[PDB]
Amino acid sequence: QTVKDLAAAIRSGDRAALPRAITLVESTRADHRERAQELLLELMPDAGRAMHVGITGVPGVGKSTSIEALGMHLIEQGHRVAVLAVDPSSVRSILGDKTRMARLAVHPDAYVRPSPSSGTLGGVAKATRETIVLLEAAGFDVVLVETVGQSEVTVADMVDTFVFLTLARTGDQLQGIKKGVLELADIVVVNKADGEHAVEARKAARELAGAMRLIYPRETLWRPPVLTMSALEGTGVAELWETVLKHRQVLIDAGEFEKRRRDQEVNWMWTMVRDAVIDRVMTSPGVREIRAEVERQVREGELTAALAAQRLLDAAELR
C-alpha cells in the first residue's frame, strides 16, 4: 500500500489501518521513519480535529476510574474517545468498539537508541504526539492523555487543557502533589469526594481555591477552578467536562486556542533539534571515554567547570 492508501484506509476505518499506522510511527527503521512523516503530512487536514485533554495524578488518586467514568459519559453523548498513556518505563488494544474507549500506550520499537538527554521519554512523547493525529484521522474527537515520573510537562505541552487529580487526606492537607505540577494545572480535582469524606474533600477544595487566590493575579484570563468529584459514584464527572469545555471557549474567545497549539508544535520541533544535538555530543566516543574522569575532577576541584566543559566539547568532535 502507498502512504495515500494507508491515509485513506485510516480515515475509512479499515480493521488493519490504525494498528499499522501505529507500528509505523513506532518504528526506528529509516524507511518507516520517512514513510511515517509522509503519512502525517498526508493526515494534516485532520490534525487538530479532537479535543486534547491531559489528565495526571499520583498512583492511587483514582485516575483510571476517573478516565473510565469520564470516557463512558462522553460516549453516552456520542463522542468517540481514545486515551493515550505516556509510559516511559513501559509498565503499560481494542480499537473497533464504538461502545468503549480506545486505550493505547505507544512506545518506540526495541531497536531505539535511548537518550542521555531524555531517557525513554523523548521517544514515547514523539510517538504519542504523532499517534494523536492518527486517532484524529480515524474519527476520534476527544483524546485524553494521561501520565503513568517526570512526564507531566511532556503531557502539558501536547494538550489544550491539563487536569490535575488530587486527594484530601483531611480538610486541611492534600496529598500526592509533586513540586512544580500544580502550576501546570488548568483544573484541579479533589477525587473520592463521597461518603463521610465528601465534606472534607470540599473543605480541601476551598482551601486550595484560597491558596490560588493568594497566588494568581486577580485579573488573569483563567483562574484554575478547584472541583470535587467521585469517580466511583459519578458525582461531579459531568461538571468536570463542562469545565473542560469552558476552558476551551475561554481560550478561543481570547484568540489563544489555535495559537497555543501552533506554539506547542514549534516548541516541540525545537526540543527535537536540541535533543538530537545534545545526544550527538553525549553519545560521542570521546565523551563516553573521558566523562567519568572529567566529572571526578570538577567534583574534587582539580578542574574548573569551564575547562571540563571545553574538554568535553573538544572530545565530541561535533563539527
Ligand X SMILES: Nc1nc2c(ncn2[C@@H]2O[C@H](COP(=O)(O)OP(=O)(O)O)[C@@H](O)[C@H]2O)c(=O)[nH]1
Q: Does 174 sit near a second copy (CB under 8 A)?
A: yes
Is residue 108 within 8 A of residue 26, CB to CB? The reply is yes
Q: Is residue 289 at the binding interface for a second copy, with CB under 8 A as the rule?
A: no
Q: How far is the CB of 237 from a second copy (least distance, A)?
A: 24
| 65 touches ligand X (CB under 6 A) | yes
**Taking CB under 5 A as the criterion, which residues in 238-277 touch Cl ion?**
252, 257-258
In this chain, which stretch among 7-15, 67-75, 232-240, 278-286 interacts with a second copy, using CB under 8 A? 278-286
CA 265, CA 160: separation in Å to the nearest integer?
12
- Binding positions for a second copy, 62-101, rule CB under 8 A: none
Pairing of strands 161-170, 173-175: antiparallel
Cα–Cα distance for residue pair 97/84, rounded to 1 Å = 16
Q: Within a 10 A sphere around the Cβ of 134, how many other Cβ atoms?
A: 26
Question: Which residues precede chain breaks (C–N over 2.5 Å) in the chain?
Answer: 92, 148
Counting contacts by CB under 6 A, is residue 243 touching ligand X?
A: no
> Is residue 78 part of an annotated ligand binding site?
no
List binders of ligand X among 183-242 (CB under 6 A).
191-192, 194, 230-232
Least CB distance from residue 15 to Cl ion, whole Å?
36
Q: Is 98 annotated as a binding residue?
A: no
199 interacts with a second copy by CB under 8 A: no
222 belongs to the binding site for Cl ion (CB under 5 A): no
Closer residue to ligand X, CB minimum distance, 8 or 232:
232
Q: Which stretch binds a second copy (CB under 8 A): 8-16, 43-51, 93-101, 105-113?
A: 43-51
Cell representation of residue 103: 486505550
Asked if residue 232 belongs to a known ligand binding site, the reply is: yes
* List of residues contacting ligand X (CB under 6 A): 57, 59-65, 191-192, 194, 230-232
* List of residues contacting a second copy (CB under 8 A): 33, 36-37, 40-41, 44-45, 47, 126, 129-130, 172-175, 177, 179-180, 182-183, 204, 207-208, 210-211, 213-215, 217-218, 262, 265-266, 268-270, 272-274, 276-278, 280-281, 294-295, 298-299, 301-309, 312-313, 316, 318-319
